Design a protein around this ligand. Structure first.
Ligand SMILES: *[C@@H]1O[C@H](CO)[C@@H](O)[C@H](O)[C@H]1NC(C)=O
Lengths: 49, 48
């Protein structure tokens, strides 16, 4: 579900927040994104690329 | 003469403040310092 913050857990990486569409071109084996605070910024769905 | 000198000096001050960026440094650095401090705090979230 989108446009609402929910407790997500992608490939063991858990957290809470909204999952919105992204325009960041992730190269083939990109899996997780990290910000300056080492927090998760973007994730790749293992089912849908 | 005093009026002309005052107007020309105000024009020179305008030119200096519009041409010299470092003339604002004594303020900008302060913000930078704060920002720097904040950044350090954020970086301290990466330590184990
Ligand atoms: C898994 O899901 C993706 C997209 O949802 C699909 O392309 C793929 O075929 C699926 N795999 C299997 C084994 O069904």
């Amino acid at each position: 579900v989108k446009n609402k913050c929910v407790n997500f857990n992608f490939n063991g990486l858990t957290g809470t927040g909204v999952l919105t569409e992204s325009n960041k071109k992730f190269l083939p084996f990109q899996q997780f994104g990290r910000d300056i605070a080492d927090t998760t910024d973007a994730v790749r769905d293992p089912q849908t690329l | 003469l005093i009026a002309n000198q005052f107007n020309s000096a105000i024009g020179k001050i305008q030119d200096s403040l519009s041409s010299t960026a470092s003339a604002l440094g004594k303020l900008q650095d302060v913000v930078n310092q704060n920002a720097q401090a904040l950044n350090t705090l954020v970086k301290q979230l990466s330590s184990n």
